[PDB]
Amino acid sequence: QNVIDPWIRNNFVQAPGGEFTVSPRNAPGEILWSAPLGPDLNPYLSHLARMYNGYAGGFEVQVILAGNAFTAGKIIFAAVPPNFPTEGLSPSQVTMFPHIIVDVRQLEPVLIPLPDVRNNFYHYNQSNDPTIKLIAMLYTPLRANNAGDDVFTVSCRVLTRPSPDFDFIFLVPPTVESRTKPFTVPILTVEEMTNSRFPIPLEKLFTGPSGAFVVQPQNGRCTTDGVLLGTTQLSPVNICTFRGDVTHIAGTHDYTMNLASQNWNNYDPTEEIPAPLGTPDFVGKIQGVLTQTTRGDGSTRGHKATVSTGSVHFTPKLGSVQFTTDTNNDLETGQNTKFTPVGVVQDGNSAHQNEPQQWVLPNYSGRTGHNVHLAPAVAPTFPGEQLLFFRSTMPGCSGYPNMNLDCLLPQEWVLHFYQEAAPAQSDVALLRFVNPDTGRVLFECKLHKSGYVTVAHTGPHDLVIPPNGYFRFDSWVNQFYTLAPMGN
Amino acid sequence: QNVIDPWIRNNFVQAPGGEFTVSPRNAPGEILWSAPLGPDLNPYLSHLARMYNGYAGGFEVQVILAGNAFTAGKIIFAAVPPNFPTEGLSPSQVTMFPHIIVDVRQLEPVLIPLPDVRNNFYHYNQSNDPTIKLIAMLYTPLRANNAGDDVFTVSCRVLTRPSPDFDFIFLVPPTVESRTKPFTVPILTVEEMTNSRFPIPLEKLFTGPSGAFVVQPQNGRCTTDGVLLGTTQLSPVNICTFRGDVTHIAGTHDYTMNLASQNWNNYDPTEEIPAPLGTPDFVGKIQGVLTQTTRGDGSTRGHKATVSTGSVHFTPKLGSVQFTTDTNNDLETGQNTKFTPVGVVQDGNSAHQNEPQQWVLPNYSGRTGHNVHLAPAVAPTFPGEQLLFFRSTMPGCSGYPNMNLDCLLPQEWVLHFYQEAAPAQSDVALLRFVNPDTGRVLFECKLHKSGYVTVAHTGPHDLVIPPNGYFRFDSWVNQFYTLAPM
Amino acid sequence: QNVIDPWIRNNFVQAPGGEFTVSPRNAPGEILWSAPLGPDLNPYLSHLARMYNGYAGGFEVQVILAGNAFTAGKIIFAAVPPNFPTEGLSPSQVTMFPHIIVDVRQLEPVLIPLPDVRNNFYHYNQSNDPTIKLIAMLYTPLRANNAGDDVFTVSCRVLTRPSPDFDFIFLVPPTVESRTKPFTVPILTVEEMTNSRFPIPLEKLFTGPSGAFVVQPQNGRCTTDGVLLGTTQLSPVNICTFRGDVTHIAGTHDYTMNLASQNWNNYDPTEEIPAPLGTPDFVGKIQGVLTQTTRGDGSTRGHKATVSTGSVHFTPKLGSVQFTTDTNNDLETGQNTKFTPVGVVQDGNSAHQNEPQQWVLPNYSGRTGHNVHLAPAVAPTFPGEQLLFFRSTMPGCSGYPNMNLDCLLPQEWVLHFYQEAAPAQSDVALLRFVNPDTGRVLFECKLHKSGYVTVAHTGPHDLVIPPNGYFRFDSWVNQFYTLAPMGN
Amino acid sequence: QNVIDPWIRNNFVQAPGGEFTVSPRNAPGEILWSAPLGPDLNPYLSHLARMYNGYAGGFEVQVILAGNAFTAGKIIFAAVPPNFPTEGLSPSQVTMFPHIIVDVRQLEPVLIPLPDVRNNFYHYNQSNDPTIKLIAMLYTPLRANNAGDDVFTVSCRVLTRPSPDFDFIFLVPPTVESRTKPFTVPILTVEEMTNSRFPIPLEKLFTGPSGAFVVQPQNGRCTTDGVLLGTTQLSPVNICTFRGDVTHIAGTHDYTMNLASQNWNNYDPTEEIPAPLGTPDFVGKIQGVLTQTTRGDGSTRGHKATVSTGSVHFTPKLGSVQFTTDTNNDLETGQNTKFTPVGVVQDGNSAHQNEPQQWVLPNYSGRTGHNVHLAPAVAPTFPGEQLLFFRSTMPGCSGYPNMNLDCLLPQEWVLHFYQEAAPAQSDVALLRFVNPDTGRVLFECKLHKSGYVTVAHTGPHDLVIPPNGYFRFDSWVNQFYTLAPM
């Protein structure tokens, strides 16, 4: 026995994840929108549910469309019982459920009740018990090609309010570990982020085709659930830093370095990670400073050094890496050393701007086997959109190296995702870039659960954005969302 | 006219910052506890007010003072008018107000009503209009008449419940830009957090005396409510790096560098910042690599270099610095150049492990002028309390440099504080280091809102830490809170 | 306890500042219209409020749109509580307030109540106490490109009426200093105005690009609040008149004149004004008549004289100016003199029509320092509009001087703004040019608070207007107003 | 309930400044009297309210007119709502307010209720909320015969008492909050106070016209509520001193001195003060003694030194002054140095009593720009009002300096105003000079909030006063009030 604010029961508010779009590309029978019946579909009820433990009641749902007077077609909303398969439901059969048919040209909203049916007294918030699922799908083919141009997108909005019999059961403190925390995105500006695959600051955003080359980086990969994938660290200082023992090679200036750990501990080759944490993810020659710190005397004399990834002597998985330097005598093998990255360089004997091939993965285990336990590849699926890369440039020292560098997620985003561990309600979350000076939205992008960002645009392009813009999270949408044109 | 859950109105719960302590170290007349009336006195109300815009009504507060039978003392509770300042209030002037005096040995809880005294219908949640304030003061010093070498610190609890006439007025969504986002600390363990004064991962914690030197670092300073001070900046990489234009000085290997802005622009000398963001704040010689990109052919040139922060020419504020290298050529004067530090070096002729001088601030304007806009100095304010430093080992390249480096706050903590502008309800936040696999508490530390951490210990001591330990926030306490010894 | 006319409570009238427009350029999340709850949003109530001191009640607001049947989208109106930030409000969150969603294709009006919430008994008219703010913003993206051409602008209109509980408190006389006087614009015709930067009558209006040169005049600058900026006087006779002592330079015809004041008082170089009041604002050679009036004998013999602004001998700030004349002996240094402007002349040794460069500001302090305390620069911000200049021509005497002259505001407008001192309710006021013969409006222009006029047009153009047209003030609008095309 | 003494509730007392006069020279429309409503109108209530927190209730005002049956003329009393400007009110408009018309022929007093109008339950003492005003204006001019050379002027007095609804709210300790602290002027005699612009004891008082020059002093400027203006300080021994480092100028007998703070710390030129505290604010030639605290051979130093306030090198704002001495080279750089003034001298190539022009401010910035953040200029505005200067004689070592130095406020007065930050209840305070030997009043003067004193006199005149006379504070009034001729 409990009561909520009387205003909530007498007004309609937008459901956090209740936005969807229809385009002529969508055919009848495809599922457009789906939502379980829970307190999370009403912002006030979602906020209150963090204070209580059990909901018990139905809803009233209101649908608003936005269509021009040229477009024609019908959209059917229906309620599906607690344990009923929804795969293969033809548009004819779905009418047998309680349903409403809404014309696209309908100015007014349409109402529908959602009475809760169950065999239990009440549900639990930290449980997955099936409930009535509200679905919305196309009824007749949509025809809007005549109107305007491009692909006329008709928008939808879903509002909800609680039924008079809705009530909560038990009162509990709102705790951090509740597993009900809403998903959020850091409000940091794009220019202050840190590149996840090299210690350099971000500068811009990029869009372009990805069909000409395979995208599968092992750095900057982290799902929205806070699970780290591939070979990703938290600290942006140990991105490409090696620490361990060093041995001189007589007759030349090359050195062989055996990696120990990030904490100067014994290396574990039995781990399922593809390569030791903090290894480079690109084929190229990297120039930096190697520093040896003798414990007794502090003989800290730095030396210029280079490492050429992708060569036959680069086997980080086995625990051996080759360094090329200028002095072959001024190093003592009895003390551990570390390597600090500085930049990349290009072999002048090859074509200009060719040495750094970010996409190509170097052979971590040399000639003894092919790399294993790699992060899954990333590629867009919905036609008409391209990946969004966070683009920066590393400094150069010699040759003409390729300045371009792209990372899927900034280091701050990875850190925040790891810290939050917020459960994902779907596979795709919708993010809008917002200018805080006026509040206008510049463009929309979809953040997939696998840890990448997609935006609807064709051809290479450099996004033009104000220096103070930031990303904001709005809702969870399914893969059928027709993303609005970017246009910047 | 909204309704609260009837369970809240009939039961007592503990306020977030609702515990204090009485210790023999406390002098008489000190403000032991202070709290303004409002939703913050009850966690349920402090969470429900996020959805509302106003409130009106009083409270009922119980105080639990279950002290030992061998102690003696008197504590006074008084109510302060809305507009009445309490900066220099004394016990007699406290007794002028409506007062209740209770023993430290009291067994029954002390019950106090707090009616809301106001000149309007209701208060605004987003505003800061003063209201009735409750203060608990140590009327009589605590003394113990027990045999044995023991200290009977008395821990006292405060519970609150809303009065029957408490109600909210208007309903608003719980957006970001509001009195929301209760304060929290990242759950990251010590190992992954990176240093704020230099790009080096942490390895240990330390506590020790600080009376022999002035502790006033400029990097890694941030108040707990999301304000950056001095030269603290978000990016863990741009911590001690420089970028700008380089010019060769004829007859010597030294180079004169004109500083650029953060990304590409020119530095503004009129900014209310002591130095360009990411300027080192310790006197010593820093070794690094100068990198230049030539637009003529795309070639990248990298050369070893050393910068003397203690030199006269080291004037980041004026926009001109001096670099020392070994090659006096192979550098163009019309291209942007970056400086990436690698480590710290020292002169072997000088005293070993005494040149870095981690607690000495180099002059940002050279001989002429002085440092102007600095962060406030940090020093403990309670007897028996020492600062807590996050210690890392900055690498060296020659000789025996003092590799021991200390930072007040890790870069992750300042990044989190800036990202989440959580308001502070008091001056001190209690943080307990806990072991998740065991459930015990290793030690208790106070996090001052100015951005530093204090503990109760005497003499130098290297902290012992489980690998999985992390900091957990518990309550809000004032400056006069006494900590349980390690 | 008081009563108002029963007709007001039973009818809707237009709110003085209640007009706004929506265009496809506007994106969701941007604030379109905002209005505090006060008596000033109802003309009858605004008139009555000048007679009373305290309002106390709510309103009923009605919204009318004007959209074709091709346009599609939604607009949301909401009420914001007395002390709630409105920055960053996403379109999803704003629905949590009391709200109404209006479709652009809605023929009928939509109603919404505005009940007043407050902690005081009643508000004060001469106070800034926060109240409920009504906001109106886009809900879904607007799509009208298919319909017609250009950028289809959909118009809006807001009507208001008082709630049954609205009542006034105290009765006071309507005084001039009330600080509640409505803003007004002089009804004088364009052809009888006086140029604010030279004593010549106005002749026409001009529009054109301003990106090729910097616009920052120091004359004719006066904000709508009656605060004088830069170096502006009230009397149009002392626009470029110098008065003070004169000293002959031996060996040539040049004279050095020390300015005293406009009232023949001691000069004050410690003033924060950039230059003495009434100095020229352009680089050029000015020809006029210098007259000396001896007190005892009235030796009033005029002499032709020229002054070359921008030269090294032109330092009005220090208090010294150089005059070039034809007679180097017929002047007595013991008597003060004045200079009367006549026209401008051009050096024939240079290119034709080049000497007068109105935009360029001469160095007021010669070589000793750069000019200080300048008026802020003026430049349009909303893309698609250009500044409106009041254009005239000065007479010429020698050479081929540039006849064109532009002033931002006429002298009569500056005088009226200084006299009225009417407070501004926003940063932009909307002015329509009206032909009084028939009452039709010719074009619309926006008068910014900084003291300049902007009109939507591209390319250089000379406006064609009837000789008897005059400007009229209608309302205050925000910077998001989409100005209608000028087209004349 | 918070009962007030019945004698207060059943008797009338005079308002602090509720007396005015109506003369035949007055024309219709002039505001004769104006006063806000509040506890201040009754001294008993104004002192009793210091122990309470809030008040609520109206007043009853009695008007007493001194006239006979051979005069004509009418006065109008009106009650202005709280937030309504009264400047520029036409004589016709005032009748639209609730008004009462009184004849100067009346003998009985006039009773006027004055209820409190507000939008909240009650007012706070520290809120300073606007309240209902009461204004008395001349409606119909005064027509009466004159007794020879004396013009017949009617007098009027105003008395107030609390309404039965007047009551206080909550009780607070009397002496912790300074917001309600009454204003008070020191009672030291004239011969004992100290001049503020130079460490010299005061000599006498001077009056005279000031329209021939700009009176803009920079020392001794302080508002009556305890706010310092310009470069005025507290210590009277640092009025014209310089502290800092010294460096000899080769080829001459001159020294460039770099200023330091009064604590021998660094001085920041960015401060929004016209000059470092203790900088002289008058053009002239100052002779003094220069003493340095030197190490090594000895600290015994000191020589006659001269400072040119009019020199182009005199840049106290930038931190550099020029000193002229008689020794070629005897000081060294790197030791703390102070300059002690002893007098003012003259140049033999200028007019007598022309160098120490006390009303001409030296250019604090030298020649690079103009002085900034100056103290507001002071000049009388009402007819027949002249400034009252505290005049002292300046000793001279050579030449014939203009020994007359004038100060608007002595150093003790500014020190007292800074110490006791008593808020001002109106725009001017009425001060009369009282001789305690006989109890008579020599003259009455107005003390403006800006920190200056005005008297009603015409032409130069040196005041003759008994040694024991001193100033006494009477009441706060507004500018409308007039003073009888001295």
Numbering used by the authors:
A (entry chain A), C (entry chain A): 45 to 532
B (entry chain B): 1045 to 1530
D (entry chain C): 2045 to 2530
Please share text taken word for word from the publication where this structure appeared.
Human noroviruses (HuNoVs) cause sporadic and epidemic viral gastroenteritis worldwide. ORF2 encodes the major capsid protein VP1 that encapsidates the (+) sense ssRNA genome and ORF3 codes for the minor structural protein VP2 that is suggested to be located internally in the capsid. All these structures showed that the capsid exhibits T = 3 icosahedral symmetry, with a diameter of ~400 Å, composed of 90 dimers of the capsid protein VP1 that consists of an internal N-terminal arm (NTA) and two distinct domains separated by a flexible hinge. In the capsid architecture, the N-terminal domain ‘ties’ the VP1 subunits through a network of interactions facing the interior of the capsid, the S domain forms the icosahedral shell, and the P domain protrudes from the S domain.
The final resolution of the cryo-EM structure is ~3.8 Å as estimated by Fourier Shell Correlation (FSC) of 0.143. The quality of the 3.8 Å cryo-EM map allowed the unambiguous fitting of all the three quasi-equivalent VP1 subunits in the T = 3 icosahedral capsid, which showed well-defined densities for their S and P domains. In all the three quasi-equivalent subunits, the P domain rests on the S domain in the resting conformation, as observed in the crystal structure. This is also evident in the cut-away view of the cryo-EM map, which shows continuous density between the S domain and the P domain. The conformations of the A and B subunits are the same as in the X-ray structure, whereas the C subunit is ‘locked’ into a singular conformation selected from one of the 15 conformations observed in the crystal structure to adhere to the icosahedrally symmetric organization. In both the crystal and solution, the capsid protein VP1 assumes a resting state stabilized by an elaborate network of NTA linking the capsid subunits and the interactions between the S and P domains, as expected in a T = 3 icosahedral capsid. A novel finding is the metal ion binding at the dimeric interface of the P domain that further stabilizes the resting conformation. Although the metal ion observed in our crystal structure is likely Cd2+, based on the composition of the crystallization buffer, the nature of the metal ion in the cryo-EM density is uncertain.
